[PDB]
Design an enzyme around this catalytic site. Structure first.
Site, PDB file in Angstrom:
ATOM      1  N   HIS A   6       0.843  -1.155   0.107  1.00 42.70           N
ATOM      2  CA  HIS A   6       0.101   0.144   0.184  1.00 42.70           C
ATOM      3  C   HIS A   6       0.859   1.063   0.064  1.00 42.70           C
ATOM      4  O   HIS A   6       0.266   2.305  -0.082  1.00 42.70           O
ATOM      5  CB  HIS A   6      -1.083   0.088   1.168  1.00 42.70           C
ATOM      6  CG  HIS A   6      -0.594   0.537   2.458  1.00 42.70           C
ATOM      7  ND1 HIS A   6      -0.040  -0.286   3.421  1.00 42.70           N
ATOM      8  CD2 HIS A   6      -0.244   1.481   3.151  1.00 42.70           C
ATOM      9  CE1 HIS A   6       0.381   0.106   4.323  1.00 42.70           C
ATOM     10  NE2 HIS A   6       0.179   1.477   4.157  1.00 42.70           N
ATOM     11  N   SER A  15       4.619   1.647   7.967  1.00 41.86           N
ATOM     12  CA  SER A  15       4.092   0.647   7.004  1.00 41.86           C
ATOM     13  C   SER A  15       5.259   0.181   6.398  1.00 41.86           C
ATOM     14  O   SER A  15       6.031   0.826   5.679  1.00 41.86           O
ATOM     15  CB  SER A  15       3.014   1.213   6.115  1.00 41.86           C
ATOM     16  OG  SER A  15       1.901   1.896   6.841  1.00 41.86           O
ATOM     17  N   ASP A  27      -0.623  -7.460   2.048  1.00 43.99           N
ATOM     18  CA  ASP A  27      -0.051  -6.094   1.806  1.00 43.99           C
ATOM     19  C   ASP A  27       1.427  -6.318   1.773  1.00 43.99           C
ATOM     20  O   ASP A  27       2.085  -5.837   2.708  1.00 43.99           O
ATOM     21  CB  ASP A  27      -0.552  -5.299   2.819  1.00 43.99           C
ATOM     22  CG  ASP A  27      -0.288  -3.790   2.746  1.00 43.99           C
ATOM     23  OD1 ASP A  27      -0.261  -3.053   3.915  1.00 43.99           O
ATOM     24  OD2 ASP A  27       0.268  -3.368   1.734  1.00 43.99           O
TER      25      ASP A  27
END
Ligand SMILES: Cc1cc(C)c2[nH]ccc2c1CN1CCCC[C@H]1c1ccc(C(=O)O)cc1
Length: 287
Positions: A49, A222, A99
Site C-alpha cells: 500500500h 508501514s 499487503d
C-alpha cells in the site's frame, strides 16, 4: 550471506543495518512515507500500500544506510492477491490482505556497516542464525520463531535519520482472538458484522497493555520489518501493515482505548510461496 547481524557501539543504522527509508514522490495526507527491509543485494521488502497502483516504479524513493542518495528502482512486485478495494461491497474501505511488495533494485547493494540483509523465515540463513541443525524444516523454524504464546518482538521508527527501536509482543497464544477482534476499534471497521473479514489468516497482531505496554505504529512505519531478536541475531517474521490508532496524529484516542490499540502485520510464514518464487535467484537458500 550472514544475515541478521550487526557488523563497536555505534548508532542508528549501525544497530539496524537492514532498515530502509521510503518516501512517496507525490505526497498527500496518509501517503507520505514508509519503511522497508534489505533482504538481499537486489531486494527491499515492504508493504504494497506504500505505492501507487499505476507506474509503481516511479512512485517512491528508497534509501538505505541512512544515506541522502536514492537507489534506482527497476521493478516493484506486488503480492498478486493484494487489492485495497477488494472489500468495498462489505463496507471495508481499505483491505490490507496480502499487503507485501518487493522492490527490485537495478544496482547491487554493497554490504557494509550500515547496509546489511535481515534473515527471512524458512531459509538456511535463518537456520544458521538460530544455530539450529541442518535437519531444520520450515515448520520447525515457525515453532522456534512463532510459538503459541505472547512473543517478544520489535520494530523500528525513523525521524530525520534517527532510528528508534520499540519492543512489542505478538499475541499468538490465548490472547490472539481478543487481539484480532480489536480491529473493530479502527475507524471504518466498526460497522462490519464479522471482523475476521478484515483480519485474515495473513495477519500477526501486536499492541495493547498486556502483557506489557506495547508502543503503537504510525502510517509512516508501514512496510517496516517486525522482528524477533534471538541471541544477537535478528529474524524478520512480519511486515507492518496497519494499526488501530495513528499515535503520531491521535495520541488522544490511544488513551481512550489503550487495551485495544492493536497493530497488524503480514505474517511472512503465510506468503512463503510468493517470497520463495520472487527471491529464488538471491542465494537465500529457501527450504
Ligand atoms: C494505513 C495505516 C498504516 C499504519 C502502519 C497505521 N498505524 C496506525 C494507523 C495506521 C494506518 C491507518 N488506518 C488503517 C486501518 C483503517 C483505520 C485507519 C486509521 C485512520 C485514522 C486513524 C487515527 O486518526 O488515529 C487510525 C487508523
Amino acid at each position: 550471506s550472514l544475515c541478521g547481524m550487526v557488523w563497536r557501539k555505534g548508532t542508528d543504522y549501525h544497530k539496524q543495518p537492514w532498515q530502509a527509508k521510503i518516501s512517496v514522490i507525490r505526497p498527500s495526507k496518509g501517503h507520505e512515507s514508509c519503511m522497508g527491509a534489505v533482504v538481499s543485494e537486489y531486494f527491499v521488502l515492504t508493504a504494497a500500500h506504500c505505492f501507487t497502483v499505476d507506474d509503481k516504479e516511479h512512485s517512491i524513493k528508497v534509501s538505505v544506510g541512512g544515506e541522502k542518495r536514492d537507489l534506482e528502482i527497476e521493478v516493484v512486485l506486488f503480492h498478486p492477491n493484494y487489492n485495497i478495494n477488494g472489500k468495498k461491497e462489505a463496507g471495508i474501505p481499505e483491505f490490507y490482505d496480502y499487503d507485501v511488495a518487493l522492490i527490485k533494485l537495478k544496482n547491487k547493494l554493497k554490504y557494509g556497516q550500515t547496509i546489511r540483509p535481515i534473515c527471512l523465515p524458512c531459509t538456511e540463513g535463518t537456520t544458521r542464525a538460530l544455530r539450529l541443525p541442518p535437519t531444520t524444516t520450515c515448520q520447525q523454524q515457525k515453532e522456534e520463531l512463532l510459538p503459541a504464546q505472547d512473543i517478544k518482538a520489535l520494530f523500528v521508527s525513523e525521524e530525520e535519520k534517527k532510528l528508534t527501536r520499540k519492543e512489542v509482543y505478538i499475541k499468538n497464544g490465548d490472547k490472539k482472538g481478543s487481539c484480532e477482534r480489536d480491529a473493530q476499534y479502527a475507524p471504518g471497521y466498526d460497522k462490519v458484522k464479522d471482523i475476521s473479514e478484515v483480519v485474515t489468516p495473513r495477519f500477526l497482531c501486536t499492541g495493547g497493555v498486556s502483557p506489557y505496554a506495547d508502543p503503537n505504529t504510525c502510517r509512516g512505519d508501514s512496510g517496516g520489518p517486525l522482528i524477533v531478536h534471538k541471541r544477537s541475531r535478528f529474524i524478520q517474521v512480519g511486515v507492518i501493515s496497519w494499526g488501530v490508532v495513528d499515535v503520531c496524529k491521535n495520541q488522544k484516542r490511544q488513551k481512550q482505548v489503550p487495551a485495544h490499540a492493536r497493530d497488524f502485520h503480514i505474517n511472512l510464514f503465510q506468503v512463503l510461496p510468493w517470497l520463495k518464487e520472487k527471491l529464488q535467484d538471491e542465494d537465500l537458500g529457501f527450504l
